[PDB]
Structure 1
Amino acid sequence: KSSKALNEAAEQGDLAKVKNLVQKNKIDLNAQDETGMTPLMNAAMGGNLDIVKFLLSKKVNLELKNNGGETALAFAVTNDAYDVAEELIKAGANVDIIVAGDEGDTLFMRAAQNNKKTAESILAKNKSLINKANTLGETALFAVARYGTPADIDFLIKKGADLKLKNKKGQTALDVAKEASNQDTAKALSKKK
């Protein structure tokens, strides 16, 4: 059975409260609540690194998923808890996962738009994720083409991004840059060889 009190303390960043419930050890730390959450997911979503470290020391399962299909690592990345994300990746969390939303963005894609260090950590575990497409046929190059910078494009190219991919609408990354009125990435992508 899940503990509502433990899950709340874990999200809120109350480590003392977490230690006072977990060491009493009436709680299965892998038990999931009514929306599929675990303590670890709560700690990750709340960016609570000390609590994540404490739960990792109890050898909790890293790969359980909530109703949105997200593991703790997905919660961390998507809530910009990149210190937590680094901790989870070093602890062996699967990086080949999908974050919530209609697009089915890869974890890598989400990190690529936002935190270079974690994007690099993901690729260090699986080089091919650079070109793994989402449900709509788009890679990180497409996301950065719309909403990123020429430097972001260069980062992705430096990591092996394929320039010729088309999404499920038949669009290239250059096509989507133009469509999103990103003059700087469109100019840059037009010239890439």
Structure 2
Amino acid sequence: GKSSKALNEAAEQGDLAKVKNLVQKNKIDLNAQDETGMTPLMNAAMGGNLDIVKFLLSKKVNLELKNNGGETALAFAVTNDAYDVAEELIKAGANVDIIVAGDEGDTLFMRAAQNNKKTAESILAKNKSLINKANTLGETALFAVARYGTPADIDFLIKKGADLKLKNKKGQTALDVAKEASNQDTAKALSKKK
């Protein structure tokens, strides 16, 4: 079927009634992607609109379609800080082993780990190995947090099984990048962890 610009706008803006009007009428394939690859669900996720997400999930939409930036609805939720929606999608069976947009190829886990601990834990409950899955530059969450996080973030990651010895594609450890980023506190903590 055809995508509807009106449905996609409604889903992003958070207008539940209009979403219901356009959907139940059934002139619209809910899995049809628009010009930039967007679905209604991706729009709802991006806008943090939990009720619309739930409505769409009750229609059994495909969770794994990707836009032109290669992102699923779950990546839209995580990357736009809609962690309520992210938890809903993870419970509905959304694949957590995905890549979010940008040159680094960060994992979903790595993005959640810098921001929302609950969601980071929900991702690992699905796939415990993600703790050490590296991005395109050979960097794990440990690297991101070494740069821009806290000793408590480092402890979180170590508790979930972070390998301390990994080296990125430049041959740097997480300690190396902490120092390069002038993060005194994480460099200190990382130097001391065994």
What TM-score do you get using the length of structure 2 for normalisation? 0.99
CA deviation after TM superposition for structure 1 residue 191, in Å: 0.3
CA deviation after TM superposition for structure 1 residue 72, in Å: 0.1
Equivalent runs, 1:1-193 vs 2, <5 Å: 1-193=2-194
Residues 93-140 of structure 1, C-alpha deviations (whole Å, 9 max, x = no match): 000000000000000000000000000000000000000000000000
Residues 127-159 of structure 1, C-alpha deviations (whole Å, 9 max, x = no match): 000000000000000000000000000000000
CA deviation after TM superposition for structure 1 residue 26, in Å: 0.7
CA deviation after TM superposition for structure 1 residue 50, in Å: 0.1
| Count of residues paired in the alignment | 193
Take 1:35 and 1:192, find their aligned partners in 2: how far apart are those partners? 45
CA deviation after TM superposition for structure 1 residue 77, in Å: 0.1
Residues 13-71 of structure 1, C-alpha deviations (whole Å, 9 max, x = no match): 00010001000011000000000000000000000000000000000000000000000
Unaligned runs of 5+ in 2: none
Alpha-carbon RMSD across the aligned residues, in angstroms, is 0.2
CA deviation after TM superposition for structure 1 residue 12, in Å: 0.2
CA deviation after TM superposition for structure 1 residue 192, in Å: 0.5
Question: Percent identity over the alignment?
Answer: 100
SS at match of 1:102: coil
Take 1:24 and 1:57, find their aligned partners in 2: how far apart are those partners? 16
CA deviation after TM superposition for structure 1 residue 88, in Å: 0.1
Take 1:58 and 1:89, find their aligned partners in 2: how far apart are those partners? 17
SS at match of 2:114: helix
Take 2:15 and 2:97, find their aligned partners in 1: how far apart are those partners? 30
Unaligned runs of 5+ in 1: none
What TM-score do you get using the length of structure 1 for normalisation? 1.00
